[PDB]
From Swiss-Prot:
<comment type="subunit">
    <text>Homodimer. Interacts with MICALL2. Interacts with RFLNA and RFLNB. Isoform 1 interacts with FBLP1, FLNA, FLNC, GP1BA, INPPL1, ITGB1A, PSEN1 and PSEN2. Isoform 3 interacts with ITGB1A, ITGB1D, ITGB3 and ITGB6. Interacts with MYOT and MYOZ1. Interacts with HBV capsid protein. Interacts with ASB2 isoform 1; the interaction targets FLNB for proteasomal degradation.</text>
</comment>
<comment type="function">
    <text>Connects cell membrane constituents to the actin cytoskeleton. May promote orthogonal branching of actin filaments and links actin filaments to membrane glycoproteins. Anchors various transmembrane proteins to the actin cytoskeleton. Interaction with FLNA may allow neuroblast migration from the ventricular zone into the cortical plate. Various interactions and localizations of isoforms affect myotube morphology and myogenesis. Isoform 6 accelerates muscle differentiation in vitro.</text>
</comment>
<feature type="repeat" description="Filamin 17">
    <location>
        <begin position="16"/>
        <end position="108"/>
    </location>
</feature>
<protein>
    <recommendedName>
        <fullName>Filamin-B</fullName>
    </recommendedName>
</protein>
<comment type="similarity">
    <text>Belongs to the filamin family.</text>
</comment>
Amino acid sequence: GSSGSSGPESPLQFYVNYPNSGSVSAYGPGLVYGVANKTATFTIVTEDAGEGGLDLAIEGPSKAEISCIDNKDGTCTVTYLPTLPGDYSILVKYNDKHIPGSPFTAKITDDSRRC
């Protein structure tokens, strides 16, 4: 036996989204964990959310700098570099409304000695 269909299709291919369902999430090896004095970045999901105002701020045992970047492809790119190993309290807000899942907890370590 064998089966398989190409599938339906229509012209003026146009897909519209509704505001009803609109949420922003964040994931990546930069929010889960990291390495002292090591490059760490993560990605953020956001499509047709609304040009409002994204704010990012991380806390912990040491103040870390943030160079969040705004892209126009599909997701944003935020790069940062830790100063000391420890649980960093990442905080992200969207249009005066925290994101579903925050604050986030990342487990960063330190690798200096050459094992």
